[PDB]
């Protein structure tokens, strides 16, 4: 029993965190094999012009108490790749993956190449993440673990004026219409991740919270007409299919749970909570619910 | 900016998790140096749990009855002893991944990270607090026994909790790493129930100071309170009494934001009376009590917005 915002064990990622210094700027890098990946803004813009003026010895890379020697450098999109003389003996099995809005991941927040905390979050529909980051956190990474393989999906680059965060995949492509520079940028209007709220409602039913269930069912079309009015993302047939297993475990059809969600949007919770929350939670995917209510290990 | 329920990086603890098997029971153990620590109920059957005599069950066991698996390697048990509700298994190999560590017993209100494990394999990490009723609101399934709670302030891991059981309300009970239970619980399947829980007042105040640091003041008012008047009101909402120790502990957050502890207590009194009126505080529509004053100082900026 119980339901917590659970992150993946961070050990495999901790063994890859390093400190990268270029002039006056210090941030975090990810050391995999003989390459250190970090945000290109460490050299700060005309990034090619700024980079051509730097030599290998201008980049100071520190792994624990050891100084790594930079023997090459190149840029890939908004990520700087520093070739080092030493391969990371702690390099786990890994892949670089680009995630979609709604998908969740764990963040290992780091400062000066030293991990300070781990938390779980989701890529919002507006491509920002509601993280917890201070100055020096740039280069901190987001990831998932599937079996023994770490899938790196996010690298932190910046904080927007509303306090939310923006970054790139590990190939340097930003999530969202953001650019790595000081200019007027703002998060777009966000929406609620509908398939995730439904997954969390199924988790509540698995945990014994059933007060919100009703005898009614709805159609996908009627549900989406209602959901669009509360700034909820449209629910697709793919989302309905993805919720199939949770629907079979609890005996509540997806459009049956949509009728429950419809009533919660129109009438509120009326002083009640669901899994200890007075808000409808959208940062647990259907897969996160299945994994936490099954005990999958790494 | 931002405020998340943040856990400590779990790597130092992951390298200590092992699987302990005794007959048909399999659970988790913590391997530090040449000793594996695990709940003593690993020696019990389900029938035994009603009224187990651990001393009688243990005397019938030899070292080779305990199977300890660390990754893909079988460790050899060369000794065993019981200390309160934990079993200590001496093994023939010291853990090369043993971090710098201490065993610490925490008080209600204190927070810690939990590395939930099954079959000696870590599955997830989450942050939680020792409730005033000595239970923890964890997320644990069958096989999670022996999973541990810890803090890692600096490079040293302070182990404070080992998971033993789930109570009828779905909350969890366990021991410190010396085998002493938190709360009036026994590692026996008898009529046991969590006492009525209360809200950790000093933690809610800390979280209100975190909201001020991150730039939000809508909940403040022009009033103050005496400590006694605050406690008379707080106890009506099932909030723990606020002591002078708690007031002293909130001193640094009070100096950083410029808001006296008793003025923040006045704001809390008003929030309890009025609710939030459609508003949120740090993305929550409830008053959060699982962040200590120390956690707020660790996570939040040193400069108020
Ligand atoms: O955003 C960035 N860093 C951070 C990242 N995360 C959490 C921070 C918290 C507190 C201060 C910085 C933080 C950096 C530096 N700054 S800044 O001048 O500090 N303005 C930020 C407060 C809004 C602009 C900037 C511009 C472009 C790029 Cl790619 C990076 C960045
Ligand atoms: O509680 C225990 N295990 C668990 C521990 N944590 C989370 C669990 C979730 C789901 C199932 C087990 C879980 C064990 C086994 N059980 S039991 O028969 O499974 N009853 C509990 C569910 C209410 C009695 C018992 C009694 C005393 C002691 Cl010391 C240990 C234990
Ligand atoms: Cl304590």
Nearest ligand to the C-alpha atom of residue B179: 2
Domain boundaries, chain B: 1-14+100-197, 15-99, 198-301
CA distances from B40 to A78, B10, B80, B128 (A): 53, 24, 11, 24
Q: B10 and A6 in contact by Cβ < 8 A?
A: no
Chain B residues in contact with A283 (beta carbon < 8 A): none
Contact B167, B193 (CB under 8 A): yes
Q: B2 and A163 in contact by Cβ < 8 A?
A: yes
Task: Considering only CA atoms, give the Rg of chain B.
Answer: 22
A52 lines ligand 1 (CB under 6 A): no
Partner residue facing B9 (CB), from A5, A117, A297:
A117
In the three-class reduction of DSSP (H, G, I as helix; E, B as strand; rest coil), residue A213 is classed as coil
Looking up tokens 């391969």 gives: A87
Contact A132, B6 (CB under 8 A): yes
Residues 58-87 of A with CB under 8 A from B: none
What pairs with residue B117 in β-bridges? B122
Short-list A34, A296, A24, A2, CA closest to A144: A296
Contact A201, A213 (CB under 8 A): no
CA gap B198, B179 in Å, rounded: 25
For A191-294, give the CATH class: mainly alpha
CA gap B122, B148 in Å, rounded: 10
Structure tokens at B290: 């699982």
In the three-class reduction of DSSP (H, G, I as helix; E, B as strand; rest coil), residue A175 is classed as coil
CA gap A239, A192 in Å, rounded: 14
Short-list B139, B205, B193, B145, CA closest to B169: B193
- DSSP symbol at A137: -
Chain B residues in contact with A159 (beta carbon < 8 A): 1
CB of B140 within 8 Å of a chain A CB? The answer is yes
Partner residue facing B9 (CB), from A10, A276, A294:
A10
Letter string b/e over residues B98-130, b meaning 16 or more CB atoms within 10 A of that residue's CB = bbebeebebebbbbbbbbbbbbbbbbbbbbbbb
Residues 217-276 of B with CB under 8 A from A: none
What is the separation of C-alpha B123 from the centre of its chain, rounded to a whole number of angstroms? 17
φ and ψ of B295, to 5 deg: -65, -35
Contact A119, B5 (CB under 8 A): yes
CA gap A110, A133 in Å, rounded: 9
Resolution at which this structure was determined, Å: 1.7
Report chain breaks in chain A, C–N > 2.5 Å, as residues after which they occur. Answer: 44
Q: B11 and A11 in contact by Cβ < 8 A?
A: yes
Residues 93-122 of A with CB under 8 A from B: 108-109, 115-119, 121
Structure tokens at B63: 């070292």
φ and ψ of B216, to 5 deg: -120, 125
- Between helix A194-206 and helix A254-267 the angle, nearest 10°, is 100
B41 assigned to active site: yes
Within chain A, where are the H helices? 11-14, 47-52, 194-206, 220-227, 237-242, 244-250, 254-267, 286-292
Short-list B132, B151, B87, B164, CA closest to B238: B132
3-state secondary structure B177-238: CCCCECCCCCCCCCCCCCCCCCECHHHHHHHHHHHHHCCCCCCCCCCCCCHHHHHHHHHCCC
CATH architecture of B1-14+100-197: Beta Barrel (2.40)
Fold matches, B1-14+100-197 and B15-99: yes
Sign of CA dihedral B113, B118, B122, B125: negative
What pairs with residue A141 in β-bridges? A108, A155
CA gap B108, B259 in Å, rounded: 26
B49 lines ligand 2 (CB under 6 A): yes
Contact A7, A42 (CB under 8 A): no
Q: B299 and A117 in contact by Cβ < 8 A?
A: yes
CATH architecture of B15-99: Beta Barrel (2.40)
Q: A117 and B284 in contact by Cβ < 8 A?
A: no
Contact A16, A28 (CB under 8 A): no
Q: How many residues does chain A have?
A: 298
Short-list A7, A20, A41, A13, CA closest to A111: A20
Q: A119 and B7 in contact by Cβ < 8 A?
A: yes
Shortest alpha-carbon distance between residue A86 and chain B (Å): 22
Contact B135, B243 (CB under 8 A): no
DSSP chain B: ------BPP-HHHHTTEEEEEETTEEEEEEEETTEEEEEGGGG--TTGGGS--HHHHHHT--GGGEEEEETTEEEPEEEEEEETTEEEEEESS--TT--SEEE----TT-EEEEEEEETTEEEEEEEEE--TTS-B-----TT-TT-EEEE-STT-EEEEEEEEEE-TTS-EEEE-TTSPBSSS--SS-SS--PPPP-B-HHHHHHHHHHHHHTT--TT--S----HHHHHHHHHTTTBPPPPHHHHHHTHHHHHHHT--HHHHHHHHHHHHHH--TT--BTTBSS---S--HHHHHHHS-SS--
Q: Residue A153 belongs to what H/E stretch?
A: strand A149-159
Check B38, B41, B85, B164 and give the catalytic one.
B41
- DSSP symbol at A230: G
Contact A97, A151 (CB under 8 A): yes
CA gap A136, A25 in Å, rounded: 9
φ and ψ of A242, to 5 deg: -60, -35
Short-list B67, B76, B90, B56, CA closest to B21: B67
For A15-92, give the CATH class: mainly beta
- DSSP symbol at A228: G
In the three-class reduction of DSSP (H, G, I as helix; E, B as strand; rest coil), residue A60 is classed as strand
Instruction: Supply angle C-alpha A2, A129, A6, rounded to 5.
Output: 20
Q: Separation of A135 CA from ligand 1 center, angstroms?
A: 7
Determine which of A3, A129, A132, A161 to mutate to test the interface with B (most B C-beta atoms within 10 Å): A132
CA gap A142, A156 in Å, rounded: 8
Contact A193, A282 (CB under 8 A): yes
Q: Which atom of ligand 1 is nearest to the CA of A180?
A: 29
Structure tokens at A54: 């730097």
- DSSP symbol at A232: B
- DSSP symbol at A276: T
Check B16, B44, B145, B160 and give the catalytic one.
B145
Chain A residues in contact with B1 (beta carbon < 8 A): 132-134, 159, 163-164
B299 lines ligand 2 (CB under 6 A): no
Q: Of the residues B27, B42, B165, which should be mutated to test ligand 2's pocket, given the most ligand atoms within 8 Å of the CB?
A: B165
CA gap B177, B36 in Å, rounded: 11
Q: In what order do the strands lie in the sheet with B35-39?
A: B73-75, B66-70, B17-22, B25-32, B35-39, B86-91, B77-83
A122 lines ligand 1 (CB under 6 A): no
CA gap A51, A116 in Å, rounded: 30
Short-list A113, A112, A131, A111, CA closest to A121: A131
Chain A residues in contact with B284 (beta carbon < 8 A): 279
Looking up tokens 């022009």 gives: B222
CA gap B14, B201 in Å, rounded: 33
Closest residue (by CA) to atom 15 of ligand 1? A158
Q: Separation of A207 CA from ligand 3 center, angstroms?
A: 30
CA gap A117, B12 in Å, rounded: 13
CATH topology of domain A1-14+93-190: Thrombin, subunit H (2.40.10)
Short-list A36, A46, A44, A95, CA closest to A68: A36
Q: What is the dotted CATH code of the domain comprising B198-301?
A: 1.10.1840.10
Q: How many residues does chain B have?
A: 305
3-state secondary structure A13-39: HHCCEEEEEECCEEEEEEEECCEEEEE
Q: B2 and A165 in contact by Cβ < 8 A?
A: yes
CA gap B263, B223 in Å, rounded: 6
Structure tokens at B192: 């046991």
A73 assigned to active site: no
CA distances from A229 to A131, A192, A220, A254 (A): 27, 11, 15, 20
CA gap B144, B148 in Å, rounded: 9
Determine which of A89, A114, A119, A160 to mutate to test the interface with B (most B C-beta atoms within 10 Å): A119
Chain B residues in contact with A2 (beta carbon < 8 A): 137-140, 170-172
CA gap B304, B291 in Å, rounded: 18
Q: A295 and B123 in contact by Cβ < 8 A?
A: yes
Contact A154, A39 (CB under 8 A): no
CA gap A195, B31 in Å, rounded: 41
> What is the pairing mode between strands A17-22 and A59-63?
antiparallel
């Amino acid at each position: 029993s119980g339901f917590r915002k659970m992150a993946f064990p961070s050990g495999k990622v901790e063994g890859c965190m390093v400190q990268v210094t270029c002039g006056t700027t210090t941030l975090n890098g990810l050391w995999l094999d003989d390459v250190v990946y970090c945000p290109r803004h460490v050299i700060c813009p005309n990034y090619e012009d700024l980079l051509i003026r730097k030599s290998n010895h201008n980049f100071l890379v520190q792994a624990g108490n050891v100084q790594l020697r930079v023997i090459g450098h190149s840029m890939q999109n908004c990520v700087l790749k520093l070739k080092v003389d030493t391969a990371n003996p702690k390099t786990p099995k890994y892949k670089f993956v680009r995630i979609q809005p709604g998908q969740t991941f764990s963040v290992l927040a780091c400062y000066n190449g030293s991990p300070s905390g781990v938390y779980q979050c989701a890529m919002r529909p507006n491509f920002t993440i509601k993280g917890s980051f201070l100055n020096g956190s740039c280069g901190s990474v987001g990831f998932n673990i599937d079996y023994d393989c770490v899938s790196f999906c996010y690298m932190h680059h910046m904080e927007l004026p509303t306090g939310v965060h923006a970054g790139t995949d590990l190939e340097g492509n930003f999530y969202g219409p953001f650019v790595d520079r000081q200019t007027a940028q703002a998060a777009g209007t966000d929406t609620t991740i509908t398939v995730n709220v439904l997954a969390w409602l199924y988790a509540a039913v698995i945990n014994g919270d059933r007060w919100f269930l009703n005898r009614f069912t709805t159609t996908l079309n009627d549900f989406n007409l209602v959901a669009m009015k509360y700034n909820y993302e449209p629910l697709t047939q793919d989302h309905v299919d993805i919720l199939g297993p949770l629907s079979a475990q609890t005996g509540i059809a997806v459009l049956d749970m949509c009728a429950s969600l419809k009533e919660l949007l129109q009438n509120g919770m009326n002083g009640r909570t669901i899994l200890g929350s007075a808000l409808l939670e959208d940062e647990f995917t259907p897969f996160d619910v299945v994994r936490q209510c099954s005990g999958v290990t790494f």
